Structure formats: C-alpha cells, structure tokens
Amino acid sequence: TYAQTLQNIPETNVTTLDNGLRVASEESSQPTCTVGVWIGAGSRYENEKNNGAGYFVEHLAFKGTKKRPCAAFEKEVESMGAHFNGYTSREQTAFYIKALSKDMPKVVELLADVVQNCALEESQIEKERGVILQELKEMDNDMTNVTFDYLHATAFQGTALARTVEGTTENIKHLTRADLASYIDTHFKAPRMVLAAAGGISHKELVDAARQHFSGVSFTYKEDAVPILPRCRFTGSEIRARDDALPVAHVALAVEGPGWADPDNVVLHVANAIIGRYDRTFGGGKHLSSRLAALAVEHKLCHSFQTFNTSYSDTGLFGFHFVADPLSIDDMMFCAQGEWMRLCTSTTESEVKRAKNHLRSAMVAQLDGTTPVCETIGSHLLNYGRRISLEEWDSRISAVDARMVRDVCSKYIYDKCPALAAVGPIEQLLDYNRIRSGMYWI
Amino acid sequence: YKETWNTGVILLLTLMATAFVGYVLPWGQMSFWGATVITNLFSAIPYIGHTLVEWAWGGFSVDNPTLTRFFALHFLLPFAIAGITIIHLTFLHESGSNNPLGISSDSDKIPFHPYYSFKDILGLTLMLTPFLTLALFSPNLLGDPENFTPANPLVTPPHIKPEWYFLFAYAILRSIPNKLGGVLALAASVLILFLIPFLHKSKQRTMTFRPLSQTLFWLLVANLLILTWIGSQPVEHPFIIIGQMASLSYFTILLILFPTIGTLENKMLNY
Amino acid sequence: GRLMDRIRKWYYNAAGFNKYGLMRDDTLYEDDDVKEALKRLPEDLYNERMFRIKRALDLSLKHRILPKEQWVKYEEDKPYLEPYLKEVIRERLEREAWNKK
Amino acid sequence: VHNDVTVPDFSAYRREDVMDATTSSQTSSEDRKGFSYLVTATACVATAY
Amino acid sequence: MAPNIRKSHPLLKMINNSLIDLPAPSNISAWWNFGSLLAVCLMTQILTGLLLAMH
Amino acid sequence: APNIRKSHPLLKMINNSLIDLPAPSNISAWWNFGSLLAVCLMTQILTGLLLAMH
Amino acid sequence: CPGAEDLEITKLPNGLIIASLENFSPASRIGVFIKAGSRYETTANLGTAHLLRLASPLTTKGASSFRITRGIEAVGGSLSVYSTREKMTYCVECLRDHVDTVMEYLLNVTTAPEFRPWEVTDLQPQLKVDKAVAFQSPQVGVLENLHAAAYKTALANPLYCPDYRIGKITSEQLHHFVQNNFTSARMALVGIGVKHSDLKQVAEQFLNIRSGAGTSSAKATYWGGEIREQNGHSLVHAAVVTEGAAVGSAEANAFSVLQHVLGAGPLIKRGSSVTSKLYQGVAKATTQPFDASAFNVNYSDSGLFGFYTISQAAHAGEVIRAAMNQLKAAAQGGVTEEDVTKAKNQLKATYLMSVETAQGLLNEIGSEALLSGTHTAPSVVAQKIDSVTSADVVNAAKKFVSGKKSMAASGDLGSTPFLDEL
Amino acid sequence: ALLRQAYSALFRRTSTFALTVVLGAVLFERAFDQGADAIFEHLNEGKLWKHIKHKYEAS
Numbered sequence A: 001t002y003a004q005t006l007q008n009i010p011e012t013n014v015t016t017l018d019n020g021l022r023v024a025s026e027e028s029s030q031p032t033c034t035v036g037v038w039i040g041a042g043s044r045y046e047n048e049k050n051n052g053a054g055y056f057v058e059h060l061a062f063k064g065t066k067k068r069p070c071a072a073f074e075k076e077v078e079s080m081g082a083h084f085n086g087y088t089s090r091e092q093t094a095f096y097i098k099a100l101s102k103d104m105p106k107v108v109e110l111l112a113d114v115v116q117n118c119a120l121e122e123s124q125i126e127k128e129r130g131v132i133l134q135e136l137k138e139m140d141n142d143m144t145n146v147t148f149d150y151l152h153a154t155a156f157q158g159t160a161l162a163r164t165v166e167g168t169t170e171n172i173k174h175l176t177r178a179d180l181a182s183y184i185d186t187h188f189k190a191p192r193m194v195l196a197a198a199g200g201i202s203h204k205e206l207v208d209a210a211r212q213h214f215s216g217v218s219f220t221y222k223e224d225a226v227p228i229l230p231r232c233r234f235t236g237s238e239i240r241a242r243d244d245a246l247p248v249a250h251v252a253l254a255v256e257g258p259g260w261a262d263p264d265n266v267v268l269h270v271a272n273a274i275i276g277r278y279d280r281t282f283g284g285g286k287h288l289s290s291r292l293a294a295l296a297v298e299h300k301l302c303h304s305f306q307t308f309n310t311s312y313s314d315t316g317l318f319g320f321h322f323v324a325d326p327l328s329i330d331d332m333m334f335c336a337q338g339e340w341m342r343l344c345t346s347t348t349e350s351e352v353k354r355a356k357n358h359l360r361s362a363m364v365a366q367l368d369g370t371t372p373v374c375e376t377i378g379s380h381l382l383n384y385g386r387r388i389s390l391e392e393w394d395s396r397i398s399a400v401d402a403r404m405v406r407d408v409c410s411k412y413i414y415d416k417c418p419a420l421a422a423v424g425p426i427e428q429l430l431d432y433n434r435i436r437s438g439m440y441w442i
Numbered sequence B: 001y002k003e004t005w006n007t008g009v010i011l012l013l014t015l016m017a018t019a020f021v022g023y024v025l026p027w028g029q030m031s032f033w034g035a036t037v038i039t040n041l042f043s044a045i046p047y048i049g050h051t052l053v054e055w056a057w058g059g060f061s062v063d064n065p066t067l068t069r070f071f072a073l074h075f076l077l078p079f080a081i082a083g084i085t086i087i088h089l090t091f092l093h094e095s096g097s098n099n100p101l102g103i104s105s106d107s108d109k110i111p112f113h114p115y116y117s118f119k120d121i122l123g124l125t126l127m128l129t130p131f132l133t134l135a136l137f138s139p140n141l142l143g144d145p146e147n148f149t150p151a152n153p154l155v156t157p158p159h160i161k162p163e164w165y166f167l168f169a170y171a172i173l174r175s176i177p178n179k180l181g182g183v184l185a186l187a188a189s190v191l192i193l194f195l196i197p198f199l200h201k202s203k204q205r206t207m208t209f210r211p212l213s214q215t216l217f218w219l220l221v222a223n224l225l226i227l228t229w230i231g232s233q234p235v236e237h238p239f240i241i242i243g244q245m246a247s248l249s250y251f252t253i254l255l256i257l258f259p260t261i262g263t264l265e266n267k268m269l270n271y
Numbered sequence C: 001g002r003l004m005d006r007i008r009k010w011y012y013n014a015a016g017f018n019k020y021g022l023m024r025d026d027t028l029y030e031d032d033d034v035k036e037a038l039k040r041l042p043e044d045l046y047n048e049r050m051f052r053i054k055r056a057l058d059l060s061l062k063h064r065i066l067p068k069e070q071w072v073k074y075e076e077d078k079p080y081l082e083p084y085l086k087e088v089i090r091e092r093l094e095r096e097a098w099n100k101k
Numbered sequence D: 001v002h003n004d005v006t007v008p009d010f011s012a013y014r015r016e017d018v019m020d021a022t023t024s025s026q027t028s029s030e031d032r033k034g035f036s037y038l039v040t041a042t043a044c045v046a047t048a049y
Numbered sequence E: 001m002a003p004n005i006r007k008s009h010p011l012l013k014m015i016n017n018s019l020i021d022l023p024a025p026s027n028i029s030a031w032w033n034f035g036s037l038l039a040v041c042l043m044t045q046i047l048t049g050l051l052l053a054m055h
Numbered sequence F: 001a002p003n004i005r006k007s008h009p010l011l012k013m014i015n016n017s018l019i020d021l022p023a024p025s026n027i028s029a030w031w032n033f034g035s036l037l038a039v040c041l042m043t044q045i046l047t048g049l050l051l052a053m054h
Numbered sequence G: 001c002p003g004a005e006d007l008e009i010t011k012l013p014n015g016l017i018i019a020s021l022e023n024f025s026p027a028s029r030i031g032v033f034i035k036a037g038s039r040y041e042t043t044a045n046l047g048t049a050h051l052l053r054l055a056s057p058l059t060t061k062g063a064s065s066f067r068i069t070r071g072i073e074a075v076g077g078s079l080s081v082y083s084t085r086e087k088m089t090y091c092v093e094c095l096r097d098h099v100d101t102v103m104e105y106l107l108n109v110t111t112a113p114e115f116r117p118w119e120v121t122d123l124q125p126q127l128k129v130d131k132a133v134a135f136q137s138p139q140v141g142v143l144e145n146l147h148a149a150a151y152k153t154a155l156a157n158p159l160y161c162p163d164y165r166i167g168k169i170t171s172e173q174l175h176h177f178v179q180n181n182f183t184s185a186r187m188a189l190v191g192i193g194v195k196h197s198d199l200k201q202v203a204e205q206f207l208n209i210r211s212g213a214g215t216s217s218a219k220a221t222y223w224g225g226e227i228r229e230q231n232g233h234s235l236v237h238a239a240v241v242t243e244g245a246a247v248g249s250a251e252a253n254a255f256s257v258l259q260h261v262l263g264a265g266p267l268i269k270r271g272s273s274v275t276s277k278l279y280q281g282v283a284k285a286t287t288q289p290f291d292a293s294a295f296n297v298n299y300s301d302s303g304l305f306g307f308y309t310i311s312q313a314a315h316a317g318e319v320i321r322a323a324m325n326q327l328k329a330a331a332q333g334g335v336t337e338e339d340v341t342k343a344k345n346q347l348k349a350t351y352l353m354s355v356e357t358a359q360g361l362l363n364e365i366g367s368e369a370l371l372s373g374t375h376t377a378p379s380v381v382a383q384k385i386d387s388v389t390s391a392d393v394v395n396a397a398k399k400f401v402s403g404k405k406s407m408a409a410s411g412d413l414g415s416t417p418f419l420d421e422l
Numbered sequence H: 001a002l003l004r005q006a007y008s009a010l011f012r013r014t015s016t017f018a019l020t021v022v023l024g025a026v027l028f029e030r031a032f033d034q035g036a037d038a039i040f041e042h043l044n045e046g047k048l049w050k051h052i053k054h055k056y057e058a059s
C-alpha cells in the first residue's frame, strides 16, 4: 500500500571524502547494478575559445587512459559485460557504468581512471575531430533540438547558457590537446563530483574503493572552493530560422525559470502536468484530458507538443514546444498561449488532483532501474545538495492546490516578455508583439 | 437560424421606428398627436426618463425642434435598414434557406436562377397589383382623415389611433392602465420575438407535421387580428375587457402554450 | 388500457408525414446530436433515409403527396435512428457530467 | 551548422538596466513595464477626457 | 484564376454568389418570396422617399 | 474554428480587414491618409446630421 | 516493515494463469499477456491484429471510449498494447492505491470490446500513420521483408497492416479474431506490485469468453526467399539469416551465445567492439563507417538467425561479405574457449539487467507464465546458459553456413550482393 | 518605487488597469479644467464679465 511503500524505500547513504569528493548509494536486493561519476561540469563552465571541450572530452573519455589504452580499456570493459555510458550537458557531465554488483569495486577503478588519468592520445583526437564534426551535421537535423538550442541562444544571449553543448564548428576544428587537458584539469575535481551507485552494493564496500582510487588530496583551501558561476541574463526575445523547404515547423516559447533550489519548481511541474504532452499517436485522441491536447485533435493543431520545466542552478526555462504544419502554427500557438493563461486564471481542483496523480507516477517512473536511480542521485546531490526521497517529493506535491498553481504560474508567466524559437516554414507565427500580448487576459 | 432571426427582429424595430417618424412629417393632426401620445410614454420611466423626453423633443412639447430632427431621422433610418438587411442576408447565406418540410435540402437543391428569380418576380406582381389597386383607386382607404387637418396643439382629435400596422401594439399598450406597465407591454409585445428561438421544444422544425401547434399558431394569428381591431376602438366596455384578454392570450401563447404543446407534441410521437 | 396507443396512433396520422413517405425519424430536425447519429447509420439505412427525403422534397415542390396505398402505417414505421440517437445523447450526457467533477 | 549562429549585440538598443549580461532582468522587469504601462494608462485618461 | 467572369470578379462574385448560383431548396413555397419583396419594397420606399424629400 | 473571430461571419470582417490584415512592414506616413479619409467621413456624416437636425 | 516476498502462480480450470509477485514498489503494473498476432492472420484478414492493437481505447460493454481514457488519466494511470507476430500484451501502470481502478478498464479492454462499426472506421486511417512513423526507421523496413522472404506463412506475415488492407478491415474481423484467439488457455494475467490473492480474485470472478484454445496457428513453414527494396538511400540496411532455433528449444542458448561471440549490441558509448568479432572483422574490410551485428529470433515453432548490416551504398558489398566469412571462420573452430567464457557473461549480464525495468521484469515473469506456466528461477537460467559447449557454438555457426539462407535489404543496392553470391 | 508599485497594484490586471483610467480620468478632468480655466482667465485679467461684474451687482 502506497502511503507505506514510500517509507520502506532504503534511505540513500552519503559520506564525503576528506578530499572534497562525495559518495552516495541506494542498496537493493539486486544482482546487477550501476555506478558513475556525476561531475558538476558543463558547456556553461566554458568560454568563447574553448566552447566544446566538455564534449570533445566526453568523446575521448573512452578511447583509453594512460594506465590502459583503447584496446585494453575497451576489451577490459566489454569482456566483463559492463556498460560504460555517459553524457554532458550545459551544467552537468556524467560517466557511469552498468554491471554485476560483483564488479562493484573493480568498476569504480575504471570510472576513476577515466576522469583523472584520461589518455588523450593526440593521434586519437584528430580522429575524434572529424567525428564530432559529423555528429553536428547529423544533430543539425533534429529540429526538436535545433530549436531548444536556438531557444537558449536568445533566451540567454550574451551569457554562458546561450551556448551549444557541442560547441562551435570552429572550436571543434581547432581545440587542442592543450585545452582538452585544461578542461579536465580545471573542471574534473573531487568536490565538484559525486560517486553514485544503486543496486546490490553496501555503502561501506563502495565508499572504500573510492577512498582507494579517489585519493587525490587537496592542500590549500582553494581546491576546496566550489567556483560560483556568473549568472546569465534572461532576455525576452525571439530568433526565427526560416526555411520553407522544411516539411514541418517547430516552435519553442518560454519564460525565465526559478532555478533548482526554489520549491515552486514543484508547482510549476504540477502545472506542466495539466497541459501535458501529445503526438499524433496518442490513442486517447479527442478524449484526452489535456485541453491543449484535445483541441490539437479537434482541429488538427499540431503533430506534437510538450511542456517543459528545464531547471538550472540559478535559472531555468519554462514553456512549451510544438511541431506543426505551416498553416496551423498560428491557431496552435494561440491555443497554447491560451491554456498557459487559463493556468494563471481559472485552474480547477480537478485539474490539479489529476496533475498530481500524474506527476507522482512520472517521478516514480524516473526511478525505474539502477541507471535511472544513480542519475537522480548523481543529480539530486550535485544540484539540490541533499537527496530528495519519493516520500518527500510526494508530500511536497500533495500540498499543492488549484489556488497555489494560479499563483505560481501567474508569478512566472503572466505579463512577462518571453523567448521565442521558430524554425522552418514559419510564415504564420509572426509578430512578437502579438505573441507578447498573449501573455495576459483569458 | 438565430442570427438571421435576430437581425430580422432589429430590421423590424428599425422599420417601425422609421415609419413612426415619417408619420410626423406631414404635420397633420394625427401626425402631431401620434407624436405626443407616444413620445409621452417615455416619461413613465423612473427618473432617467422625465428628461429623456424633453431631450427627445428638443423642447417641452412636440414642436419644430422635433419635426426637423424627426425628418433627419426619417432620412437616415431607411439606409440603416438597407445596411442591416445586408447583414441579414449574410447570416442567411451561412446556412441557406430553410424549407417547408424542415429536413436537409442538400439532397436536392436548385439554382436561385431562374427558378426563384422567376418565382420571385411573379410573387412581386401578385402583390404589387393590390398595392397599386388600392393606391390608385382608393388612396385614403387606409389613412385616417384627421391628418388632413393641419396640426393644432390646442385641439385634440376625437380619436387618436395609428395606422393599422401599429394597431395591434396600440391595443396592448392601452390594455394596461398604468403608463409604465403599458409601455413595457408594448415593448415586450414586440421585443418578445427575440425569445422565440429559446422557446422551441419540438423535435421537428416546421409545424407542417404538427397539427396541434398549427391551430395554436392560427389561434395566435387571429389573436393579432383581434388586437388590431381592439386597437381601432375606444376605451369603453366591452372593448377594454376584450382588450386585456387578447393581449393576455397573446403573451400566454408565445410564452406557455407554444413551448408546452410542443413538448406534449413530442411525446405523442413517442420521442 | 389502450388509451395511449390509440392516441399515439392518432397523432401519428394527424401529423401525416407518412403521406410523404417519411418515417418518424426522417422528419427529425438535425441538431448536433441527430447530426452525429446519422453519420453512424449503416450505409444502406442511411442511403434509404436519403432518397425518402429527396423524394419527399420533390413532392412538396410539386405540391403533391403519395397515393393513399403508399403512405406509411403507424406500425410499419421503422425507428431506425432512435437507438443510434439515445446512445449519442447518453455518451454526451456522460462526458458533460464528467467535466464538472 | 546551427551551432555557428548567435544572437547579435543589441547594446545600442537595450534599456539601461537589462544591459549587463550578469544582472537578473527579473528585478528591473516591473519597472520597465510599469513605465510604458503608465504612458499608456495615461494616454487613456487623456483620450477619455 | 477562373474561366467565366462572375466567379473571378470581386464584384460579380457578389452579384452572383447571392442571387444566381445561390443554392436554394427545390421545395420552398410562396412564403419565401417575402424576402425579396421586403427588399424590393425598401428599394422603392427609399426612392419615392427621396423624390418627396426633394420637395 | 478555435478562437471566435475567424468562425464568426461578422468578427471575421472586423478582424480580417483591421487586425490580422497582412500589411507591408515598410509603408510610410503616406499610407495613413487611407484611414484618416475614412475617419474623416465617419465624422462629417455625424456632424452633418447633428446640423441637419437644426 | 515489508521485504522479500515470493512469486505465486496459480492456474484455474479454464487454463488461465496468474503470475503474481509483490515487490513493494510504490507502483503496480498489471498486464494481460496473450498468444495472438500476425501469425494467426489469414490472407483474407491481414492486419486485423494491428488494428486491434490500436483499437484498445475503443468502447467496451463496460467502459466508454471516454471513461477509459479519462478514467485512467484521472489517476495518473496509463495503458498500452505490445505485440509480436505471436504475442500480445495489454498492460496498465499506476500508483498502488489505484490498482483495481486501473483494472476495470484493463479487464474490459481485452475481454469485452464492442468494436462499434463507426468507431472502427473512425480509426482505420490511424494505421496509415502509425505505420508511417514506424517505417521512419529502415531498421523496421528490412525486418518486415525479412520475415516475408524467410517464410511462406504465419510468421511470414507483416507486423504492420499492408497498405491495401488499410480501411478494409471489418468490425466482424476484429471480433472473430478476438473470440477466436483471446481465450483463457492462451491468456495469462501477470502483474507486479500486488498480492497474488487479489490478482487472482479478479481473474476468476471477472474473466469470461475464454475457456478454450481457440484457433490453431498455421504451422510456420520455411521458404528461403530474398526481397530487395531499391530506394536510393545513402545507407543500405541488409540482414541475412537462416532458420535458427525456437523458443524453449535446447539449441537456443547456442545462438544466443554464438550471437554474443559474434557481437550484438555495444557497451562503450561511441566506441568499438574489440570483443565483437563480427564488428571487428567487418572493420578490417570496410573503410567508411557502418554497423553490423548478430540477429537472433526465437519463435514458438521456429526461429531466425544471422547478421545485419548498415553501410555506405558502395561498401554494402564488401561489408556483407566480410560479415559472412567472419561467420564461417567462427563456424570452423575459430572460436576460442575463452571467447565463449566471456560471451557467456555478456549474456548473463544483459539478461540480468533487463529485469530492472518493470517493463522488462513484468515481461519476463509473463512470457514464461504463458509458454510454460513456470518461472525458471534465475540460477536455473544460469545453470542452463553456461551449460553450453564450444561445440554447441561452432556447430550452431555451421547450421547457418549450410542451411538455406534468405536475405532482405533496403537502400541503394547497386553494390549490394545477391543471396546466391555468398 | 512607484513604477514598481504601480505595475503591481495598477497596470497589472487589465481590470485594475481600466479601473484606474476611470478614476484617474475623473481626477484629471476635475483638475485639468481648473488649471486651464484659471490660466485662460489670468491671460484676460479684468476683461471678462466675471471681473467687471461687481460694478452693477447689488439688489
């Protein structure tokens, strides 16, 4: 029974290493497991000349280490059935491995090696250069993203956040064994990292292995100092990339967010739960509960749309993104901005109750497996400081009510200048002004 | 056809007002007095009316200031009618003509021309005839004579009564003894139309297949004839009582019978 | 107590849409509901309903009716739409009350 | 590619406040609007009269 | 745009699609003539109306 | 229609002629005379009556 | 305070199965597994299964297309269908308290659908699209033709309704299909997050129309064909396989392992599979990028096995061949006793990691509880896995080189080799 | 911080906004006229009958 199953979930253990780094884990009766290093690094922490290092690095983090080059490293990992994966976004890089709880320790070693003693054989770089260079030309055709990026690039413009996590085309072309080093150098440091694990592992056993390979001690106090980032200025504006030869069109609209810390992020989510999401394959179709959805069917408004609450350390982007035919863009937008409004004005207790029960399931969902748990933990700590339990989250959610939503949405949505990203055959979206006004009264 | 209807009603209202002013122009006894009797009703409204009137007259009684402004008004309104008429026909062309049977015509529609353009012109002649016939052989058959006597504010005509087309209303106005009430009754006597739509209960549209409603309908029509007649008569028994009744039944039908007999009708079809 | 039936049958002949060869449900005014039901009608039943009307109109335009032998009869009138209808009204009535919740 | 595109410099046109790419526009927001919205509001009373 | 000249003319397209190609039931009776009559009626009053007003 | 100014046979004329109307982005002041001319009429007619009434 | 419960699994007279398992997760996940699919479809009713897959949200004798969606959404619930040529599963996820509530619909959806003629037609066009997004991945383009050019029946049928039959399926076809295949004996009411007792009470007092084994699936015959879709693409997907083993079969694990030994799926983001011989061998022959793996299918009464490539139009040829040889070299003692040992774990792992996701774990519990009515414990599938000899493998690799092969490709094949040229 | 405070209690909702214009205009009129009339009269000191009235007024 719910109310109870939430407590039985084993508390997550956290103990920091006297050298800055931290360790956390959730032990379960599972044979398999997952562990990884969640570095608080990103494209935000980059700059004009280096833009793209954290990615170029992410690329060379597996082509060997000094201790054991490409062949052996790869061989060593495949041969034990482990899965070494990882990513790297604007404010969070992460390298993690999936394997039998048996390899628990031996694993850490690997992780540890990669971050610290990464090979960086200059012969492999000139090879990884042409690679990224392709990943761009290929990622350069995923409008859903091309959009979000452009969205960021204007939402923040003239700030670190307005940068692609893949970096410029130039940077990729000229980055050097040098700078690549520098990034890892300056960025991959103990305090700014979290060793996370969940599966059939005892905090003890784990914590130790870390104490064994994560031994690098800090002398001064500066090596203990977590660099605070210069905030990014939000700018109500728009960027329109027109190409009428594009089959469909993408549109992203957003407002400045509150940042990881702020509690309202929860509310904001409950909200997004109400406007939900949709793609032409949802089966509920005209009967769906999200008013925006339904209409999108009753009028063929779009192809897909989604509400998102991206949260960064000190900021965030709140909004929605839809894809649609060149001739329904308008109606669609209209309806969307509309719904948004209703949020601040006539949201009901039924809409919330539903949104809450949806959110609950959505949160629980993010923790389906080991990989998804360490991700959360790697994140929770790094971002929130502590680690929030489903029992906590849940309560924080049960506390929200209609009245509460209308107030928070009103706070971050009502009469605010927003950021707009239009890409494709967008001759119908037109005029910020109009789009602006759609930010009040409804 | 809600819109097409409401625009209609307005059109009527405008037409009514329009004549009303046009009548004053010849400034004959009836011209004058009809003005005074009617305009004087407005003074029954509380507070905000005793003024509305002296404003409307441009003075303290129907006089030149009025005549002149009425003429201007009579020049104007027709155009405003033409205008709305355009909107009327538009809301119509949004659905097309309703047909005597009350069932989808899509299964068989014909081009206005020459079918209805031809029908229309015949219809025209079949009317224009008596119109000319009366207007060429019996000019004043309709018009009261007191209007051949130059208006004189000092002397009042024996009987003050409008043109037939305002009679029915006149009769209802005069049925209620209380300027204010009678005014309301007059207003509502015509305003009521707007309600009609919201007072349809039959599962069918036209009365073609609804015998009951039909007679209630003809009872209503005749009910107007009576009101008309009652309006061309003075305020003495029996008239008065007959008067109040007729009006009483007029509203009763459009308000209670019609919608009720409609429902009841539906159940006999077993719907 | 055949009072009712006697009446219903009366009124039925009273309204006399049979004279046109119509079915009770043909004469139904096409409000949103009816509009829906009709769309659900199986090809045949719908195509039949159609002709009947197109026939009826042609009569009315002609100012004629069907010969007494062809009129429809109270008990032979097939309420082909009622069922489809009721359900629509049921389906809607559901939705409606659920959006209040 | 799209990674090669950046929103130009609007230095010349930005408002005195939202000019420093390190300052939360969200503080000066209410001001910036409250002004124009006053101009407007005023213009209405001007018309009204 | 179009072949004939009463569907591609922003004016004849209004003297046509409202009085000539206009879709009309095939069974409307005499009680539908009052429409045009009412119109024609207006067309006339206004005319005689002016003619009088001129004197 | 979703909104109510494109599916209303009237607002569809108060809109598609004065609000959603596609206008060049570079027309100058010599294009204002259009509306002025209109407004002008709206007024003369009004003052015109007001006088005619006396 | 909870803990470690045990998996109960009952069977009633009608032959229905109930695989339980309370794992005290804050979220339950019930599901109806069934023996249905494009396998029991006749040329006269093709795709009728596909449609049935989307027909899930349609009205039932119990719930309305409306209450089904709104009712389920109302509790942050969810429901969906998952099927292969031979297996169909209707499952619904939700918070624990909202189980029985999410059940009403599940039960109804799979046992009492009304398949209203209109609702059906006002759905047909969806296949036109559902099948459009799908075929956005050529990966599914060759896979359809593969099975086609591999068989002559049942398993030879497409998983996505052919175009011609779009909109020509009937309401009756749906029904008959269901009345015929969705019958107790072929059905299993699995489900996590709940006490076996409940998931039981439901199943019995509630489930009807069953009692039987319904129609029999036409035994799957092998063809050995070769289909080619020339379509001018930079890439050329191509898969060549041979009759592999079948589910439950002994000769299964062999391939499953011969698969890993050959290399199927990566574990190093953006890397190479030094462990994977196929990949490796392929790299030594081709110049430009690509991807090749071990294709292994295990069906009720048959299976498929071979490789699957992807490669620049001009390198298609060399990339396919290279794949072949690297299959022969394995078919002839070119398999180290060590290779086996490693692949024996890469498999144990993969298996083990699949059962973390309730979507993967529920599945597992079900599959068996349907094609056996037994849940072969974890250490049993372990004793049964490594119990494979270097021989079982090499021989598994031969069965391939000698048996009749059937290819299937889709790209600018101007350089892609014909099945007979290997 | 008037502009802030204004944008909050006044120019925010389109309701209180309007409500302000109304009341606001009221004040504007009531006091725009005074100033205007005063100004006007001043520019015509002793020419208006408002001034030279005292010379014939007394019952």
Ligand code: HEM
Binding pocket: B001, B004, B005, B006, B007, B008, B009, B010, B011, B012, B015, B081, B085, B088, B089, B092, B096, B097, B098, B099, B193, E031, E032, E033, E034, E035, E036, E038, E039, E042
């Ligand atoms: C200002 C004068 C008016 C003019 C010149 C006018 C003209 C027309 C015309 C041309 C038609 C189409 C043909 C027809 O008569 O059926 C029409 C239809 C209609 N008018 Fe009027 N009309 C007028 C007044 C009114 C009034 C006062 C009403 C009633 C409140 C009204 C109600 C209707 C309705 C309901 C239709 C629909 C006809 C149908 O059932 O097909 N109209 N009108």
Ligand code: HEM
Binding pocket: B015, B018, B019, B020, B022, B023, B024, B025, B026, B074, B075, B076, B077, B078, B079, B081, B143, E042, E045, E046, E047, E048, E049, E050, E052, E053, E054
């Ligand atoms: C809406 C259409 C019209 C109606 C219903 C109408 C009606 C009348 C009426 C009721 C009279 C009294 C007639 C009498 O003495 O018996 C009249 C007179 C007159 N009307 Fe109109 N009228 C209409 C249009 C016009 C128009 C458009 C004008 C000119 C703009 C006009 C100018 C006059 C004049 C000059 C008189 C006064 C002299 C006279 O009585 O002959 N009328 N009108």
Ligand code: HEM
Binding pocket: F030, F031, F032, F033, F034, F035, F037, F038, F041
């Ligand atoms: C009866 C008074 C008139 C009114 C109220 C009127 C109104 C307008 C309006 C509202 C416009 C659109 C905006 C603009 O001004 O560009 C327009 C456009 C135009 N009008 Fe007039 N107009 C009038 C008379 C005329 C006259 C006498 C001419 C010259 C023979 C004329 C020629 C045009 C032209 C050529 C345009 C196109 C404007 C463009 O180039 O975009 N108009 N008018």
Ligand code: HEM
Binding pocket: F041, F044, F045, F046, F047, F048, F049, F051, F052, F053
């Ligand atoms: C097309 C718009 C109009 C124009 C261009 C116009 C122009 C004028 C002109 C040229 C005069 C002479 C003014 C003077 O004495 O210096 C005048 C007078 C007058 N107009 Fe109009 N007018 C217009 C509309 C109207 C209308 C619509 C009416 C009422 C239907 C009207 C009624 C009068 C009256 C009563 C006078 C005579 C008394 C006077 O001069 O003040 N006018 N108008």
Ligand SMILES: CO/N=C(/C(=O)OC)c1ccccc1COc1cc(C)c(I)cc1C
Binding pocket: B016, B017, B019, B020, B021, B023, B024, B030, B031, B033, B034, B035, B037, B038, B160, B161, B162, B163, B166, B167, B169, B170, B171, B173, B190
């Ligand atoms: C100026 O008086 N005009 C009259 C007339 O009949 O004009 C055609 C007239 C003459 C004598 C008595 C009453 C009137 C006006 O009466 C009206 C006028 C209107 C509008 C309506 I509704 C209802 C009534 C009863």
Ligand SMILES: [Zn+2]
Binding pocket: B144, B145, B146, B159
């Ligand atoms: Zn007389």
